[PDB]
Design a protein around this ligand. Sequence first.
Ligand SMILES: *[C@@H]1O[C@H](CO)[C@@H](O[C@@H]2O[C@H](CO)[C@@H](O)[C@H](O)[C@H]2NC(C)=O)[C@H](O)[C@H]1NC(C)=O
Ligand SMILES: *[C@@H]1O[C@H](CO)[C@@H](O[C@@H]2O[C@H](CO)[C@@H](O)[C@H](O)[C@H]2NC(C)=O)[C@H](O)[C@H]1NC(C)=O
Ligand SMILES: *[C@@H]1O[C@H](CO)[C@@H](O[C@@H]2O[C@H](CO)[C@@H](O)[C@H](O)[C@H]2NC(C)=O)[C@H](O)[C@H]1NC(C)=O
Ligand SMILES: *[C@@H]1O[C@H](CO)[C@@H](O[C@@H]2O[C@H](CO)[C@@H](O)[C@H](O)[C@H]2NC(C)=O)[C@H](O)[C@H]1NC(C)=O
Ligand SMILES: *[C@@H]1O[C@H](CO)[C@@H](O[C@@H]2O[C@H](CO)[C@@H](O)[C@H](O)[C@H]2NC(C)=O)[C@H](O)[C@H]1NC(C)=O
Lengths: 342, 342, 342, 342, 342
Amino acid sequence: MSPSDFLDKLMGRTSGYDARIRPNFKGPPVNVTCNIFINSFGSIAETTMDYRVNIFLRQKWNDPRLAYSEYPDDSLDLDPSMLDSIWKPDLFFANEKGANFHEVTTDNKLLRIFKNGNVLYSIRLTLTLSCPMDLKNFPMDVQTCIMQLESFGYTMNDLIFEWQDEAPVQVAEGLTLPQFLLKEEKDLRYCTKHYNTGKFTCIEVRFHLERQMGYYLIQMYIPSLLIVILSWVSFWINMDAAPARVALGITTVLTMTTQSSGSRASLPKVSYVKAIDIWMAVCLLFVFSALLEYAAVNFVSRQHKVFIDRAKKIDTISRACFPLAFLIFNIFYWVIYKILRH
Amino acid sequence: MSPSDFLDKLMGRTSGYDARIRPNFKGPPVNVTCNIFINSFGSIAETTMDYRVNIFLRQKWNDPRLAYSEYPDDSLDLDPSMLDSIWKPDLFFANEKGANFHEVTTDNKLLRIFKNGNVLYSIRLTLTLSCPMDLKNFPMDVQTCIMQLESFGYTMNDLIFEWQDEAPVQVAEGLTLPQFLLKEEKDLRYCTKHYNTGKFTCIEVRFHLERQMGYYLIQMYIPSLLIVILSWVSFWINMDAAPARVALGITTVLTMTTQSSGSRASLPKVSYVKAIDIWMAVCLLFVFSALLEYAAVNFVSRQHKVFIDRAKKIDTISRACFPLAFLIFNIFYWVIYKILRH
Amino acid sequence: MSPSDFLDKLMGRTSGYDARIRPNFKGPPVNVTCNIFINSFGSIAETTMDYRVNIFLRQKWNDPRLAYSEYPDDSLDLDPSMLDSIWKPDLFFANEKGANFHEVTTDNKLLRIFKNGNVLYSIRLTLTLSCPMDLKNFPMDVQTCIMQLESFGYTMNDLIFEWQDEAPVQVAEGLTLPQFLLKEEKDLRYCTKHYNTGKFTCIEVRFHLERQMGYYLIQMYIPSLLIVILSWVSFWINMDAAPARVALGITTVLTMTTQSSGSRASLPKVSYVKAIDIWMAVCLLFVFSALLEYAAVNFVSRQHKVFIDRAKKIDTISRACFPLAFLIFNIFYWVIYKILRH
Amino acid sequence: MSPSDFLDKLMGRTSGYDARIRPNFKGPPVNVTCNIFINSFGSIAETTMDYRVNIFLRQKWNDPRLAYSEYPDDSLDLDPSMLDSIWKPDLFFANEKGANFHEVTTDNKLLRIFKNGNVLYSIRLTLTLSCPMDLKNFPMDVQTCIMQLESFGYTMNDLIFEWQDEAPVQVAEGLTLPQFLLKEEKDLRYCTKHYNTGKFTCIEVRFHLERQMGYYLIQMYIPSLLIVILSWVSFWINMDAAPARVALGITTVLTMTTQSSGSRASLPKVSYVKAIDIWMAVCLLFVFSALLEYAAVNFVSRQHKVFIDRAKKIDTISRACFPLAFLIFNIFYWVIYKILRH
Amino acid sequence: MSPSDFLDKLMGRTSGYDARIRPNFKGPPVNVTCNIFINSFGSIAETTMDYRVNIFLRQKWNDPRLAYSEYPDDSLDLDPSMLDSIWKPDLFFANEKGANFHEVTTDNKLLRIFKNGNVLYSIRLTLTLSCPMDLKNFPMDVQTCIMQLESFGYTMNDLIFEWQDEAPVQVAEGLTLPQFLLKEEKDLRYCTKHYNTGKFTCIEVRFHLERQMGYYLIQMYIPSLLIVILSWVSFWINMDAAPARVALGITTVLTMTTQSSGSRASLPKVSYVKAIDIWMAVCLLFVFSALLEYAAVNFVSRQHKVFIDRAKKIDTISRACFPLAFLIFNIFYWVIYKILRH
Ligand SMILES: *[C@@H]1O[C@H](CO)[C@@H](O[C@@H]2O[C@H](CO)[C@@H](O)[C@H](O)[C@H]2NC(C)=O)[C@H](O)[C@H]1NC(C)=O
Ligand SMILES: *[C@@H]1O[C@H](CO)[C@@H](O[C@@H]2O[C@H](CO)[C@@H](O)[C@H](O)[C@H]2NC(C)=O)[C@H](O)[C@H]1NC(C)=O
Ligand SMILES: *[C@@H]1O[C@H](CO)[C@@H](O[C@@H]2O[C@H](CO)[C@@H](O)[C@H](O)[C@H]2NC(C)=O)[C@H](O)[C@H]1NC(C)=O
Ligand SMILES: *[C@@H]1O[C@H](CO)[C@@H](O[C@@H]2O[C@H](CO)[C@@H](O)[C@H](O)[C@H]2NC(C)=O)[C@H](O)[C@H]1NC(C)=O
Ligand SMILES: *[C@@H]1O[C@H](CO)[C@@H](O[C@@H]2O[C@H](CO)[C@@H](O)[C@H](O)[C@H]2NC(C)=O)[C@H](O)[C@H]1NC(C)=O
């Protein structure tokens, strides 16, 4: 017998199957088991606070009205064009901003019915899910991206969503990200919603992303430290070398400003302060104070042996004072961003 | 009895229900109560003057032709595919530039009919609403974003829109914005339209957004002030140090110009003047005048004891005159932008 | 009687109404009166030469086959889903690159039929209309944007388009533009097309846009003038101060180049010369000549009393010669761009 | 008689017209004459190698099965909704990456049938056609854009495409391009394809685009030449002026680097060398050699009358040697890019 | 006889053809032979890790139920509108993020049936395929782009995909890429998938892309080397020339920083270190050490004949030491990136 003809007998008007009535309409709720396979992951943007995924979604549930025993085959396949003749759960993604299905060649959907009445429903789709980001410690920050699966109009006494026991969420190997690193550990939660109407089923997954630091370390932190160090060689130059010392100080200030201005074009645009901003401001303050040191030294010396000793004392003190304060600032800055980060 | 079969009897040709005829076609107008739940908020742009939202819209009204008493159930659910068989209000958003519905998995729409005839209609959609912006005080500015709900072809004697009493507008917790802060207070208005045809119902909501200032303060205002201060140390250098003083002045001017040029790439593009532009121009004028001070001083001295006293008097006067004028400008600038802002 | 049932009798097969036959098929042409209400205006781009509008379009014409007298009501409303059962003009926008209708909630369309047979047809749509731009005087330029309404396949002996007498075009209050100013005066034209087939009806509107100048004046013209002025203080420095004068000249040249390079990132990208480009080049030429003046002066002096007088004469002449030529250039530049602009 | 009723008799089941059978199914092939009218032209990009057009396409062919003599009218118009009931050629654009039709108001399509059986089919559509570009001589380059019209599944013994004799291709007046100039001369070709199946008809048009040079000349070539000239004034300064000469040389190098860095942001991004790159590198090499000249001169002089003569000889030789080599390079560079360009 | 009427007899209800039943439903699997012709290739982006293609896909398989002998014609063509009445393989692209078909003029699809029952199915479509990239050696890197063809719901005992023997993959001549070079060699693989359900057929192709180096060599590597060389001329200047030597060193540092900042805007944005970053950092370290050399030399000399000899010894050693270390670094850097690259 034709499988299509058998499916017609199973789900036609003579059978009386109603696609708008859920299975077990009188008694216990329907239990749906879900799996997610992630094919691609990326397009993480802070201007819109969202990311893009391409996933495989599989749902399994039992429909006692679809049980059959006459047909020898143990499974039956349904045409994607007739999927509206069967009951399906009204799943939707809560934090979703855009989605679509895939139609290249044939429609990317599959539905299978077994002898006992179990239904397997696997579909492929692309999502744009929103995720808030903090960026308060931007060079050293960890972000969490979630994905919520919810029912639209069924309460907990009608529909229940559960994760699989073996492997709910899997990620294809070889995926890379230009800016982040996706950790292998994932969390499965129960974010049940409580409204006036009642409780609504909802399951959640969490992804942890860590940002790499090599480019920032080699392109922003090291040159700033080198410029700050170069600003210290003024204290080792003779005090009667004003056209050299003043020029060196002002050119170090200019170099610091050009470095900071160049670094701004390749950073996220936010209105609040970040750790790299704090570092940049402190380096600018250091190279700014280095010039006032020599300004104070030149005035005291010109004032008319005691005067020329006091001017030299300031240089000898500064030679050891400036690196010590810089080191104290460095250790304070690094411990609170590499330890106080959980 | 099947709920779908009962709905067919209620809204079929035998019943004679007409979807193109509003409820109470002869007498009083229809009253519609509206709720809005905001899921996401962002994508605020000044180039296009618009923002993006993802909302839940709920409408409630009474239809006496849909009252039923035979069916034991107190509520009935309608299939989203047959929503064209029932009368719905012709609501639309007046300041909308783009909208779409959501179809991932099942269509994201719901319609419920109660025994007395009340109808609940909840749908999910994404909007692109336009909002004019001023940006005349750009670092310290407050913007207001509105959302207008209007009827397309029904006058006030046929259709009336009202807000809920309990909670018209709600916002999901945890929403963040890269540039603005959304205040918790919202306004509900009655922006009724008066045309030649007649009065048309319209309700409005207002959102207040405040821009943060930490990044601008730490990256634009402070370095400019530091450069202006550095330009003042020329007055404390010996007047016979022309290769030092001239070089310091011209390098401070160059540093100011590089800072201003670097800051321009990360600002909104408008054709009118802003407060940050005023600040930048004043700082440039100060560092420009500092060099002319020394130009005047070098000429008077070379002219051939009275001459060398007059040159020193200018330096001694400038040492106190320049910071005083800068302080006066600072307090004048800050009070009119932090007080005269309502 | 049901209005829908009456409309069925009026426009059914028993009536014999044909939607593919224009009114007055044998005799005089159909006269259509048009109104346009503009809701939003913006997204003006020079890379693609186009702008975006959101408008309300209303058309009115008389159909003698739709006259009715039995029904007491003075007006009848047609369902948007059945709009294909009535004859409508084949209007289209000639300079249009993209358009779409609005479907949020219900379709944004309306059709009304009166007793005498008059038809009112109001619809809402979004356009992307193309407009060529010159940008030859870019800081001080006026652009004109047009909007053409044309018939696709009807000649002047079948279809005629006319503007309203009272108010063809209206603009909603409160619209702002980030770069331009929209003048309140509009033009109504008759841009009838003449082809081999015959004359085709076409009406036109014109919008005048003026660009603001405050940002450009405060950020490009003033700093360049300040740098040019700073380049003149070399003539007031002692001629035996080569490490000061040469450094000041070359640093002014460098500052001019940095200002010009920074200003380029925020300007329209075209391949022809603009007024701001002319100004930038002239300022660079001035600061370039200022250094050659001192180069000539240093050589004549070293050559071995008559020689040291000739060198001083050049400085004394230049002190008055350079600002005079700059002033002459300034007045010549400004009069031809603020007067010869119509 | 109704024209629609006559068309029904002409192309109904009683007539037996088959839309899947080409005219003259047994004998000679069908000859189709094509016209193209271009409404807009632009959006030329090198990152994607494509351009955008909005055109009117007209096709004419003879169908002997559609000849009529009973109806007095000499022409008949077909409804755009019933265009699938008639045979049309399967034309498509070979180098097309994206296309769509226009539906604002009514569908922008037209089909007319004459008494002898001739068919006129005019439609409006938007294309995104791909064009490879070289950019090897980027400031002075000419690009050619093509447009291929091909049949999908008909060989030369079934379908033949021909251009019109009078005016195949026309361009609307007033079109402007921000970067290129469209020449008035166009080419018509026969790019017939030869495959295993057989010969397939294909016609081609070519457009020639020339890039303007005013902006590049006034903003890149002239300032570089001015900086190179400024680097030559070191040879006219006294050899015992090291803090002036060294500073002038290094500042000219820095100015050259800043100019080159600023110019890079507004150029096409390719991985191969361009003429502007060659010019930039040569200018940098010149300003680099100018400093080594003075480095060599200072060492020879300090070495301890014969020594001080040799140092002066180098300066006197360089004063004439450097501009001569620069002039030779200039004429060599310009002749091979303005003559060897065909 | 009409070919459409013959096709109706062949694939109608009287024939009993079922489009949901694969050929040879009881026995051996179906063998499908595939060809791919690439029309365009480009839009390679590292922010989204994907590329765009426009291809022709051809599939051939044998259907014994479609064999015919009555009709004299050796081939029959099927209408694209009725393609759902025939069985087609459920091919899909595994690494695909977006796809669409082409409808300009007629639909771009073709299906032919021969006498023995063979089916030829050629269609045109556009893809957006994802490809991970490394960019760890960014100036000198080779990337591989794949394209996977897979079945959605058929195991290896039902459906098998094979490449053609003669020419599976062909590329149109004249294709260019702004950044890469496409090698002429391609690979054909068998990437069969093993799941819990069973084995699924899958074929793969690989494309090798090489990045050109001319622009990077002429714009980044050469100027950095020139600046490093210019930093070495300090060792040939007299040690008592502090205002010259210090200024030259600090200006070389500033020039290096400006070059590095300018080069950053035109590079891919990643968070890990690249070869160009390593080169930039080493050049900055060299120009940084050159200034400390003179700082050490000036202090030793001022300390108060033995002292003035030790200071000169450092300069004489550095004159040969610095270029030697630079050369060693250069050869080490180039051999490990031009040899250790496979
Ligand atoms: C769906 O799962 C729930 C949870 O296991 C089932 O509800 C339980 O059913 C068992 C019967 O074996 C009862 O003993 C439990 O008390 C039920 N749980 C609760 C909280 O009441 C439910 O039966 C399942 N649905 C179906 C159709 O089997
Ligand atoms: C919709 O609301 C309006 C406003 O309350 C109702 O109009 C009023 O109806 C009451 C009857 O209880 C009258 O006493 C008032 O005079 C009415 N207001 C006005 C301004 O005339 C209207 O009845 C409501 N619609 C329905 C169907 O109940
Ligand atoms: C549409 O408008 C035109 C222009 O007014 C009408 O044509 C005129 O009709 C009057 C009749 O009252 C004649 O006296 C004029 O000579 C006509 N103008 C021309 C140029 O011939 C036309 O009648 C209108 N259409 C309809 C249906 O009334
Ligand atoms: C389409 O055009 C071709 C080319 O002119 C026609 O083929 C020619 O027909 C004439 C008959 O007048 C013959 O004398 C020529 O020998 C034909 N050319 C070739 C190359 O064989 C063809 O007849 C035209 N199609 C129709 C339907 O008229
Ligand atoms: C599809 O191709 C496969 C592989 O060649 C065919 O399977 C083989 O069929 C031959 C019969 O000529 C057997 O001798 C081989 O043992 C088969 N291979 C295996 C691995 O069992 C298959 O018959 C082809 N399908 C059709 C419909 O002809």
